[PDB]
Design an enzyme around this catalytic site. Structure first.
Site, short mmCIF file in Angstrom:
data_model
loop_
_atom_site.label_atom_id
_atom_site.label_comp_id
_atom_site.label_asym_id
_atom_site.label_seq_id
_atom_site.Cartn_x
_atom_site.Cartn_y
_atom_site.Cartn_z
N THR A 289 0.91 -1.18 -0.16
CA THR A 289 -0.17 -0.17 0.00
C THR A 289 0.88 1.23 -0.09
O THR A 289 0.65 2.10 -0.74
CB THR A 289 -0.92 0.06 1.17
OG1 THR A 289 -1.61 -1.22 1.34
CG2 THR A 289 -1.87 1.24 1.15
N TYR B 272 -12.74 -4.30 -1.60
CA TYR B 272 -13.85 -3.65 -2.37
C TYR B 272 -14.97 -5.06 -2.92
O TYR B 272 -16.08 -4.67 -2.56
CB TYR B 272 -13.47 -3.30 -3.84
CG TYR B 272 -14.68 -2.77 -4.82
CD1 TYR B 272 -15.26 -1.69 -4.23
CD2 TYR B 272 -15.15 -3.33 -5.72
CE1 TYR B 272 -16.35 -1.14 -4.91
CE2 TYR B 272 -15.99 -2.92 -6.59
CZ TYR B 272 -16.76 -1.92 -6.12
OH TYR B 272 -17.82 -1.47 -6.70
N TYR C 51 -2.49 -10.08 5.37
CA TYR C 51 -2.40 -8.75 5.58
C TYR C 51 -3.99 -8.46 5.78
O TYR C 51 -4.96 -8.26 4.81
CB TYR C 51 -1.75 -8.25 4.61
CG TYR C 51 -1.83 -6.46 4.77
CD1 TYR C 51 -2.14 -5.92 6.08
CD2 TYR C 51 -1.57 -5.76 3.94
CE1 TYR C 51 -2.10 -4.44 6.29
CE2 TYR C 51 -1.39 -4.32 4.08
CZ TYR C 51 -1.97 -3.68 5.46
OH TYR C 51 -1.84 -2.43 5.42
N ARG D 142 -9.48 -0.30 4.92
CA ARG D 142 -9.19 -0.12 3.42
C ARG D 142 -9.85 -0.97 2.53
O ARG D 142 -10.34 -0.86 1.48
CB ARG D 142 -7.74 -0.06 2.93
CG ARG D 142 -6.99 1.16 3.56
CD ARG D 142 -5.63 1.15 3.28
NE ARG D 142 -4.62 2.42 3.51
CZ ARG D 142 -4.66 3.37 2.74
NH1 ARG D 142 -5.18 3.29 1.30
NH2 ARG D 142 -3.91 4.26 3.13
N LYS E 37 0.18 -9.69 9.08
CA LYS E 37 -0.02 -8.45 9.40
C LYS E 37 -1.22 -7.99 9.63
O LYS E 37 -2.19 -8.28 8.79
CB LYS E 37 0.61 -7.57 8.10
CG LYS E 37 0.84 -5.96 8.49
CD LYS E 37 1.29 -5.29 7.37
CE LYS E 37 1.24 -3.77 7.42
NZ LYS E 37 1.50 -2.83 6.29
N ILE F 233 5.56 -3.78 10.66
CA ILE F 233 5.51 -3.45 9.29
C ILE F 233 4.91 -2.08 8.91
O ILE F 233 3.77 -1.90 9.12
CB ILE F 233 4.93 -4.63 8.33
CG1 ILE F 233 5.50 -5.82 8.18
CG2 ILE F 233 4.80 -3.89 6.65
CD1 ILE F 233 4.87 -7.17 7.91
CL LIG Z 1 -2.03 2.09 6.15
#
Ligand SMILES: [Cl-]
Ligand SMILES: [Cl-]
Lengths: 295, 300
Positions: A45, A108, A134, A139, A162, A204
């Site tokens: 990202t 999405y 992750y 998001r 993560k 991370i």
């Molecule tokens: Cl972020």
């Protein structure tokens, strides 16, 4: 496996014409070697994976591996919201020489738990490279819960996760449901010290793009259990833990980088835009407060 | 008139993309869906939007589906191609591949996952619109994208000549009024939330790009006409019959439930769906089958 401690989610520096700036990318890899960063995530990202088509993705990762010349593990991003696309991205990275791949949950399209499992199982099935999962619902619109992660532990090459939720209680839950062997990374700088203190393996991070030395001290002290030294190090950089998100990551961090002279240009691919004038002041203050040397 | 009536309005179906057992596109079911919508009176078809599983079709397969839907329609029903992407370049690419397909308009979701600022949203759509002369419909769905594109940002795109309106899925019906007061009376407003579709029309929206359209097009149409005509009684009476579907088609993420229904109808031949999406889980089978009975659907 055995990536841990302070892992930088690296930005992708761009030329003013919008192409990748390989001179700055090289400078950044040396920089993280010079300071003591434990690993580099290429094209996640923060590295703007959304706006990098597969051929550019492969290039930046491949170049990062070359510049590292075996001195620091490089982890390539391999997230996509179509299983077939993820497999292809994974296969194109199979021989670049990455230590691991970081794959975000499909965003999405909001698949179910059963689908995430089938998704990651099929992605892991197409490689020998270690996979890190992750979760970032802020998001992706999907929360991959520890119960779901736990069903993936038995996939030989899924090595950890993560988690960016900032929900510290998950460490215990993850430890409990997965093994002691499963690797748990934090993806939320604001809660990271605490995350490690509760039994995480590393971080991370966005901020160690710009304060790696101190971010390292904090991570090492936390893992050793020297809480006093961990908090002491956290103290000086804590301001960035919110400042680097006044607009969505990596808009602020990339401005902060090209500002400290780390990179040649502040260019960023659309739909992302350079940090608004409105926030220039806020971030310069948080930067001076973290003992970052302008200009 | 001026001169042959109809801009894209009324009852629009966010079309399902039907698949064969091996995951390839099922063109014979696709043509059947297109006939079905014509027979039943649907105003327009969005092809390869979210409900059409756009995320799991690469650009080549995406444009074939759009190209064929247009073709099966053969001038009887407007077709809108999806052109959404979270990278500007990718959406320009996708837009260009759809110029000269015979598409009445394009529908493009706001960039997802990467969370651009409003200035970024404007630059994105300006650049997409600049690369075509097909009309563009903006799509706001924060529940999926994690940006909320506010009315005040939409208003700054009204000036961009071929941007013709917006599909808003938030279900905040107060936005109709806000959008009216900032955009044209001419700017087309579409509801993207079926649970509040009726109310959205009644308040001044121009249409509904709906999921339930897939399986109840006649009553849905009826509901939209009536509400547009300002005949609240008939609209509400239409709504009441099918309202149960507005919750039941979302027990897993769309289009998982609607696809199951359409198969159990079955408008399609197979209920197959592409990873990371999975067929509706059995836990919800009874939930959905009974919601379908209450909405007057049969066989079975
Ligand atoms: Cl972020
Ligand atoms: Cl949904």
């Amino acid at each position: 496996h055995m990536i841990n401690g302070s892992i930088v989610a690296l930005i992708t520096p761009l030329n003013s014409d919008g192409t990748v700036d390989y001179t700055s990318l090289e400078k950044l890899v040396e920089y993280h070697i010079t300071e003591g960063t434990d690993a580099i995530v290429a094209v996640g990202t923060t590295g703007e994976s959304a706006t990098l088509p597969i051929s550019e993705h492969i290039a930046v990762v491949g170049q990062t591996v070359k510049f590292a010349s075996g001195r620091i593990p490089v982890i390539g991003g391999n997230g996509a919201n179509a299983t077939a696309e993820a497999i292809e991205l994974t296969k194109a990275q199979n021989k670049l020489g990455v230590a691991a791949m970081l794959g975000v949950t499909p965003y999405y399209n909001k698949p179910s738990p059963k689908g995430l499992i089938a998704h990651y199982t099929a992605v892991a099935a197409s490689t020998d490279i270690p996979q890190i999962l992750y979760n970032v619902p802020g998001r992706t619109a999907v929360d991959m819960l520890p119960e779901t992660i736990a069903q993936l532990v038995e996939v030989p090459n899924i090595i950890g996760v993560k988690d960016a939720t900032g929900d510290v209680a998950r460490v215990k839950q993850l430890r409990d449901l997965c093994g002691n062997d499963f690797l748990l990374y934090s993806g939320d700088d604001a809660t990271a010290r605490e995350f490690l203190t509760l039994g995480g393996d590393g971080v991370i991070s966005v901020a160690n793009n710009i304060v790696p030395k101190l971010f390292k001290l904090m991570c090492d002290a936390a893992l050793a259990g020297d809480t006093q030294a961990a908090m002491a190090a956290e103290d000086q950089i804590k301001g960035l833990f919110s400042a680097l998100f006044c607009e969505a990551n990596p808009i602020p961090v990339k401005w902060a980088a090209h500002k400290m002279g780390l990179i040649s240009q502040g260019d960023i691919r659309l739909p992302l835009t350079e940090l608004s004038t409105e926030f220039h002041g806020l971030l310069l203050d948080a930067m001076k407060n973290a003992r970052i040397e302008v200009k």
